[PDB]
Write a structure and sequence with these properties.
Helix 1 crosses helix 2 and helix 3 crosses helix 4. The chain has a 6-stranded mixed β-sheet, with helices on both faces. The chain is α/β, with parallel strands linked by helices and 156 residues long. The protein starts with a strand and ends with a helix. Bound molecules: calcium ion.
């Protein structure tokens, strides 16, 4: 199963509280830039898992405008910045055995980094710039292979 792990776009420095911070215009542009690139890679997303924080959901919104995504997304409380990487991993292993072909995960740091290390033995947590995406190939046993990582600064 193909797992695309994405960090949300650039978010506003100020809001009433962290969970409701919106994406900046730059955050919107960089997310669409990445979405357009995934479209050129001939990528087809079957399932989408997203954090409940507004910045992750708005990133999903911007991505869905350039890339074909399923009708509904799964909002996981475990995808917040301090979510349990073990539960997210178990969730992904469940879908792999279910037969799901690909998944797009939009989350935050540091979780996004820990998730790669958790899924791919021998890999230390990679750094993620906003809107950056890492591709991982996962099998029924929960073992993954870290394929590559692409970021906005690279596409530019
Ligand atoms: Ca469009």
């Amino acid at each position: 199963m193909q797992v695309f792990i994405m960090r949300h776009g650039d978010a506003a420095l100020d809001a009433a509280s962290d969970s409701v911070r919106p994406l900046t215009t730059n955050g919107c542009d960089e997310s669409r830039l990445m979405a357009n690139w995934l479209k050129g890679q001939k990528v087809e997303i079957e399932r989408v898992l997203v954090s409940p924080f507004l910045r992750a959901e708005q990133t999903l919104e911007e991505v869905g405008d350039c890339l074909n995504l399923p009708s509904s997304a799964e909002v996981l409380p475990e995808l917040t910045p301090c979510g349990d990487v073990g539960l997210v991993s178990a969730y992904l292993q469940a879908l792999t055995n279910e037969g799901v072909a690909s998944v797009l995960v939009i989350s935050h740091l540091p979780l996004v980094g820990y998730l790669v290390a958790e899924l791919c033995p021998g890999e230390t947590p990679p750094m993620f710039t906003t809107s950056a995406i890492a591709s991982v190939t996962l099998d029924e046993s929960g073992n993954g292979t870290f394929n590559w990582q692409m970021s906005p600064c690279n596409l530019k």
